[PDB]
Ligand SMILES: CC(=O)N(c1cc(O)ccc1C)c1cn(C(C)=O)c2ccccc12
Protein backbone atom coordinates (compact mmCIF):
# COMPACT_ATOMS: atom_id res chain seq x y z
CA UNK A 1 0.00 0.00 0.00
CA UNK A 2 2.62 2.54 1.11
CA UNK A 3 4.41 1.97 -2.19
CA UNK A 4 1.38 3.08 -4.20
CA UNK A 5 0.48 6.01 -1.93
CA UNK A 6 3.80 7.70 -2.71
CA UNK A 7 3.17 7.13 -6.42
CA UNK A 8 -0.03 9.14 -6.03
CA UNK A 9 1.82 11.91 -4.16
CA UNK A 10 4.56 12.23 -6.76
CA UNK A 11 2.24 11.95 -9.78
CA UNK A 12 0.01 14.66 -8.27
CA UNK A 13 3.09 16.82 -7.70
CA UNK A 14 4.24 16.23 -11.28
CA UNK A 15 0.75 16.95 -12.67
CA UNK A 16 0.68 20.32 -10.89
CA UNK A 17 4.30 21.23 -11.63
CA UNK A 18 4.97 24.44 -13.58
CA UNK A 19 7.05 22.50 -16.12
CA UNK A 20 4.50 19.70 -16.64
CA UNK A 21 2.68 21.25 -19.62
CA UNK A 22 4.33 19.03 -22.33
CA UNK A 23 3.45 15.84 -20.47
CA UNK A 24 -0.15 16.22 -19.30
CA UNK A 25 -1.63 14.91 -22.60
CA UNK A 26 -0.50 12.20 -25.05
CA UNK A 27 1.39 13.68 -27.95
CA UNK A 28 -0.90 14.03 -30.97
CA UNK A 29 0.99 12.27 -33.78
CA UNK A 30 -1.20 14.05 -36.37
CA UNK A 31 0.23 17.39 -35.17
CA UNK A 32 3.81 16.40 -34.31
CA UNK A 33 5.68 15.36 -37.43
CA UNK A 34 7.80 12.25 -37.01
CA UNK A 35 6.53 11.37 -33.52
CA UNK A 36 4.91 8.05 -34.46
CA UNK A 37 8.04 6.94 -36.34
CA UNK A 38 10.56 8.01 -33.65
CA UNK A 39 8.81 7.22 -30.33
CA UNK A 40 7.83 3.53 -30.07
CA UNK A 41 6.22 3.61 -26.59
CA UNK A 42 4.54 6.95 -25.87
CA UNK A 43 3.82 7.83 -22.26
CA UNK A 44 2.42 10.86 -20.45
CA UNK A 45 1.05 11.81 -17.04
CA UNK A 46 -2.65 11.38 -17.91
CA UNK A 47 -1.93 7.84 -19.18
CA UNK A 48 -0.14 7.08 -15.90
CA UNK A 49 -3.07 8.61 -14.00
CA UNK A 50 -5.61 6.40 -15.81
CA UNK A 51 -3.55 3.30 -15.04
CA UNK A 52 -3.02 4.29 -11.40
CA UNK A 53 -6.73 5.04 -10.84
CA UNK A 54 -7.72 1.68 -12.37
CA UNK A 55 -5.23 -0.19 -10.13
CA UNK A 56 -3.05 -1.23 -13.09
CA UNK A 57 0.30 -0.68 -11.32
CA UNK A 58 1.65 -3.78 -9.57
CA UNK A 59 4.60 -2.14 -7.81
CA UNK A 60 6.30 1.21 -7.43
CA UNK A 61 8.89 0.04 -9.99
CA UNK A 62 6.33 -0.30 -12.77
CA UNK A 63 5.26 3.26 -11.99
CA UNK A 64 8.78 4.70 -12.10
CA UNK A 65 9.45 2.94 -15.41
CA UNK A 66 6.50 4.80 -16.91
CA UNK A 67 7.75 8.07 -15.42
CA UNK A 68 11.27 7.52 -16.76
CA UNK A 69 9.74 6.61 -20.13
CA UNK A 70 8.12 10.07 -20.34
CA UNK A 71 11.52 11.70 -19.96
CA UNK A 72 13.43 9.25 -22.18
CA UNK A 73 10.90 9.91 -24.95
CA UNK A 74 11.21 13.64 -24.32
CA UNK A 75 15.00 13.59 -24.71
CA UNK A 76 14.76 11.30 -27.75
CA UNK A 77 12.32 13.53 -29.64
CA UNK A 78 13.24 17.03 -28.43
CA UNK A 79 16.48 18.99 -28.45
CA UNK A 80 17.80 19.83 -25.00
CA UNK A 81 17.55 23.56 -25.78
CA UNK A 82 14.01 23.32 -27.14
CA UNK A 83 11.13 24.59 -25.01
CA UNK A 84 9.83 21.04 -24.51
CA UNK A 85 13.31 19.67 -23.85
CA UNK A 86 13.97 22.32 -21.21
CA UNK A 87 10.64 21.57 -19.56
CA UNK A 88 11.42 17.86 -19.54
CA UNK A 89 14.83 18.29 -17.94
CA UNK A 90 13.16 20.22 -15.09
CA UNK A 91 10.53 17.48 -14.75
CA UNK A 92 13.06 14.62 -14.94
CA UNK A 93 15.25 16.18 -12.23
CA UNK A 94 12.16 16.76 -10.08
CA UNK A 95 11.05 13.13 -10.41
CA UNK A 96 14.46 11.55 -9.83
CA UNK A 97 15.11 13.80 -6.82
CA UNK A 98 11.70 13.28 -5.22
CA UNK A 99 11.69 9.54 -5.92
CA UNK A 100 15.08 9.11 -4.20
CA UNK A 101 13.99 11.49 -1.38
CA UNK A 102 11.67 8.62 -0.42
CA UNK A 103 13.35 5.29 -1.22
C1 LIG B 1 3.98 20.78 -25.61
C2 LIG B 1 2.68 20.17 -26.03
O1 LIG B 1 1.61 20.69 -25.77
N1 LIG B 1 2.74 18.93 -26.74
C3 LIG B 1 1.51 18.30 -27.16
C4 LIG B 1 1.17 18.42 -28.51
C5 LIG B 1 0.00 17.85 -29.00
O2 LIG B 1 -0.31 17.99 -30.38
C6 LIG B 1 -0.86 17.16 -28.14
C7 LIG B 1 -0.55 17.05 -26.79
C8 LIG B 1 0.64 17.61 -26.29
C9 LIG B 1 0.96 17.45 -24.81
C10 LIG B 1 4.03 18.31 -27.03
C11 LIG B 1 4.63 17.35 -26.23
N2 LIG B 1 5.78 17.00 -26.80
C12 LIG B 1 6.65 16.01 -26.24
C13 LIG B 1 6.23 15.36 -24.93
O3 LIG B 1 7.69 15.70 -26.80
C14 LIG B 1 5.99 17.69 -27.98
C15 LIG B 1 7.06 17.65 -28.91
C16 LIG B 1 7.01 18.48 -30.03
C17 LIG B 1 5.92 19.35 -30.23
C18 LIG B 1 4.86 19.39 -29.31
C19 LIG B 1 4.90 18.54 -28.17
Ligand SMILES: [Mg+2]
Pocket residue numbers: 096
Ligand atom coordinates in the same frame (compact mmCIF):
# COMPACT_ATOMS: atom_id res chain seq x y z
MG1 LIG C 1 21.45 10.81 -9.88
